[model samples]
Target: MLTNLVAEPFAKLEQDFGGSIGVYAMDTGSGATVSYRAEERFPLCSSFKGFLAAAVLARSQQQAGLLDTPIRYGKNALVPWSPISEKYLTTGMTVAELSAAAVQYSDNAAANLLLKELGGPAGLTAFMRSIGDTTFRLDRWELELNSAIPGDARDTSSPRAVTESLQKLTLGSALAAPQRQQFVDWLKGNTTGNHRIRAAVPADWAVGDKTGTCGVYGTANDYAVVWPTGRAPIVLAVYTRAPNKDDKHSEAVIAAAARLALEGLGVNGQ
Candidate 1:
């Protein structure tokens, strides 16, 4: 049964386009989701950054903090894809700036700093639970920094749970208005990793999203709110583990899924 359920869509895709494919989707506001996996626990890669954004916002609200509060950076804070890691080994940036950089550039250093400030895995878990994400568990944050050894597959969250979290963020029910505004602004500024979700959608459409790729593997994970022209918003999450490394098939998977999700939501030309 699972085989047919999983194979049917791809069978059709192969017939039409000559490639294997897999996809998952959700419409959080309307309580709808479709998936082939009986159990979903793919690595978050960078898509977890969205939850990080929510966690940061929650912490800021509880702390009643200002976004402009400056935070210093040191050599130890370095992580992958960070400007700080590249040249300016020692510099200072504000909380708001760091968070924005984490989303926009997928900066590892800034993310680690924010994760540490948000009180690591325990604090992140508490925040997710507070927002009613009971199934999601963040065992550690800044996965590469906190330990010399690799963490236990880092963590996992389901597509339904992620969509629910985003729904909460959008409604501002889980964060103060100022913090929520900051999150929205950062999401809008995100630029570095959008190829998958944006590929099938129009350039002008508003996409508040993040993408994730695990280590060097072809593990492509993406999630976003696709707000196309003159229609209700749609939420999507795609998590794929490549059959082998060095494959670019994930891009096509994402574009196809985006096209299907948008078509389901009445958006055309995807």
Candidate 2:
């Protein structure tokens, strides 16, 4: 089995981290996959922002000029971590800018604004369903959605599901060519995720990723589409959670798991 090649190392990694780690990596060109706990549900946390942005881009295709529309909101709309939206609060921001902030900075208010435009959590859930993903779901808004409540199943998806849906949106026909490239651009410009999937990828490769941190239970995750210079693009997701609430998520562990995934697929980091 493709996963069996990396099963033992994944097990040891999870044991050493004192938490459960889920991973699903795919070589799109070769159809090769490496999966460990890929089907298990893990909190979506901020990672949902990526899908949120994609949904907005999808809407832009039909709405026409949707991305350029300037949206203005009051201070009440601002949340704790709205780094981008807060800066442009008085001036308002275009839909495209907000989408970029949500994906690049995990901007809470920007995400909420976009979510409201999309008809809330259920809307994004439906968007996922439309993409042929059965395991993806978003039942709440930001900050609250990042609860990471153990086994709650709300706002959660399997690593495999995340990777599949991401592949479809970024590399498939889920979005129009322009919107598709825009989505990829947003992920590429992300200021976060430096320590997650990107860290495991080789310097010569082109990569883009989104990161999520629930700040509890060691719950954190990252998903990405990577382009190796001389090879096919690979898509991967890594999610982690611990039994205890105080357990801290490890960036190194995520990077290590990603390394194992690439190695399992016979891709040398060197």
Candidate 3:
């Protein structure tokens, strides 16, 4: 279905940008795709939370109500970039609530809590392999105090890999129906990345997406499954990195890429 997609829009975007950008979009129902440097790896940042949520849900199958389990944090567990921690210090939260906070609000503390419960990076990697995806890596814990590590070395995935995983999730290959639906529900409630892919889609359309941003190096990304009314869902992953720390530029680039991709797929909306 996407065999006739032209590279003009993506090419024009590359020409107009000063840094790296990767994009991949696929029609899940038809298995048609369009991409630009989609295989290149980029840091996932908080975007890894989606996979974390999936892993947790998978484990919950063995332990009923695992998602409802309560967890408490100490001073050491507190981390920056976490809205949950800011509001509920040293308090307890359910596993499902933590996952929601991590995914919807990009809460680092909630992510770390879920990571520890899911057996850390090793567990996440195992989950990825179980789903037949090896291109993504979960290498480290959340940010540490006084650490000098680079973002790319922590957790990373290529645009193609992310899109493939999203496809699996959508088709019930990676997760069962209920678990997949729950994850998608969390994404739909996401408060971040509203200015990126979601901004370009029609208001009536349903979009489930995750956004990632890293340090001052200008890394910004949005990966999503967009469902246009009466049409098959489109899975898209967009990654951008620039030397300058200009978030608006990268977000605008992602928005434009989404618009072009939808146009190529013959899905039209304001």
Measured by TM-score, the strongest candidate is 2
1 versus 2: better lDDT goes to? 2
Tens-digit lDDT track of model 2 for 69-180: 9999999999999999999999999999999999999999999999999999999999999999989999999779988988899999999999999999999999999999
Model 2 scores what on Cα lDDT? 0.93
Candidate whose lDDT is highest = 2
TM-score of candidate 3 versus the correct structure, residues matched by position: 0.91
lDDT of 3 by residue, 162-253 (tens): 98887787655577778888988988899997999998888898998988776645567888989888878889898876655443336788
Model-by-model lDDT, in order? 0.63, 0.93, 0.79
Per-residue alpha-carbon lDDT of candidate 1 for residues 47-120, written as tens digits (9 for 90 to 100): 66767777877777656664677888777777757864345465588777777777777778877777788777
Q: What is model 2's C-alpha RMSD?
A: 1.1
With a 3 Å backbone cut-off (N, CA, C), the pairs that clash in candidate 2 are: none
Q: Using Cα atoms with residue i matched to residue i, what is each candidate's TM-score against the true structure? A: 0.80, 0.98, 0.91
TM-score of candidate 2 relative to the true fold: 0.98
